[PDB]
Amino acid sequence: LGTNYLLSGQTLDREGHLKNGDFDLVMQDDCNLVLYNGNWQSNTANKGRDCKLTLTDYGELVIKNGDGSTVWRSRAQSVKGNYAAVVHPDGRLVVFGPSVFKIDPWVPG
Amino acid sequence: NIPFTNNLLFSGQVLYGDGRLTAKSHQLVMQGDCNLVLYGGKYGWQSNTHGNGEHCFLRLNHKGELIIKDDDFKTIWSSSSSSKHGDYVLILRDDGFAVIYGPAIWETSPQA
Ligand SMILES: OC[C@H]1O[C@@H](O)[C@@H](O)[C@@H](O)[C@@H]1O
Ligand SMILES: OC[C@H]1O[C@@H](O)[C@@H](O)[C@@H](O)[C@@H]1O
Numbered sequence: 001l002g003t004n005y006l007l008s009g010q011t012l013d014r015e016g017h018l019k020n021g022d023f024d025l026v027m028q029d030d031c032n033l034v035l036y037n038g039n040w041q042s043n044t045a046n047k048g049r050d051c052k053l054t055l056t057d058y059g060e061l062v063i064k065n066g067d068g069s070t071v072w073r074s075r076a077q078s079v080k081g082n083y084a085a086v087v088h089p090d091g092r093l094v095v096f097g098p099s100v101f102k103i104d105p106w107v108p109g
Numbered sequence: 110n111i112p113f114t115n116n117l118l119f120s121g122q123v124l125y126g127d128g129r130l131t132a133k134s135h136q137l138v139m140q141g142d143c144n145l146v147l148y149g150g151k152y153g154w155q156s157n158t159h160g161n162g163e164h165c166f167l168r169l170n171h172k173g174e175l176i177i178k179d180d181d182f183k184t185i186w187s188s189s190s191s192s193k194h195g196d197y198v199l200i201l202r203d204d205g206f207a208v209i210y211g212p213a214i215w216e217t218s219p220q221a
């Protein structure tokens with residue numbers, strides 16, 4: 001979790017959100033993912049409680065409930081690699097990936 | 110054009126003249142001296158292209174290439190990482206990594 005992206009492997013929890021401008025993806029109470037001002041939803045209300053939003057090794061967005069079941073998949077697939085779901089400022093949620101380049105300020109020059 | 114977000118650079122946008130990505134404890138700055146420098150980290154990063162050119166600017170394209178051009182469009186530096194043609198982004202992540210993800214495989218709705 002880091003404000004406007006969810007990297008693959010990260011989890012957006014109940015009440016957790018991604019914000020860019022007048023835009024807000026909330027992982028809501030009723031297991032519904034609503035992208036406010038974005039006219040979009042997972043459209044999975046009440047289909048769970050205590051749910052969680054995840055991104056796969058393959059760049060798919062998945063929602064599981066409190067129990068453990070997949071409740072929505074984005075259905076899109078690409079290769080094994082790193083991915084970022086990002087809140088574009090136009091108001092879309094986009095899954096980018098896989099990683100194609102890395103700058104590492106921890107290992108030396 | 111595309112509105113700015115301090116930690117992203119989508120294919121198309123162009124930083125120059127000490128423009129920068131800013132995240133948590135880091136900055137990746139396309140400086141005035143034609144050197145692209147990530148600040149912070151344990152060691153940080155540069156492309157060492159200091160003085161190599163005038164009025165240089167940075168731009169991630171739609172093939173996944175993040176490039177530095179000078180005012181005459183001479184390549185000064187490439188991320189040298191061309192891949193599938195589509196929409197790319199460069200995140201300066203909160204963990205310090207500048208990473209280029211792409212292309213785009215899924216959306217809530219289309220651009221225009
Ligand atoms: O597209 C989802 C929309 O659903 C509506 O009923 C409300 O919840 C709106 O706030 C939301 O934008
Ligand atoms: O579930 C696959 C697709 O179905 C659509 O109706 C929307 O819910 C999209 O957000 C989703 O990507």
Ligand SMILES: OC[C@H]1O[C@@H](O)[C@@H](O)[C@@H](O)[C@@H]1O
Nearest residue numbers: 089090110111112113121122
């Ligand atoms: O900042 C330049 C901007 O000019 C505005 O009037 C719009 O056309 C935007 O799409 C563009 O980004």
Ligand SMILES: OC[C@H]1O[C@@H](O)[C@@H](O)[C@@H](O)[C@@H]1O
Nearest residue numbers: 140142144145146155157159
């Ligand atoms: O203070 C910033 C300066 O850092 C120096 O070491 C140079 O390498 C330049 O790239 C830069 O202008």
Ligand SMILES: OC[C@H]1O[C@@H](O)[C@@H](O)[C@@H](O)[C@@H]1O
Nearest residue numbers: 111119120121196197220221
């Ligand atoms: O069609 C998708 C469009 O996405 C936008 O953000 C820009 O990258 C356009 O250049 C691109 O064509």
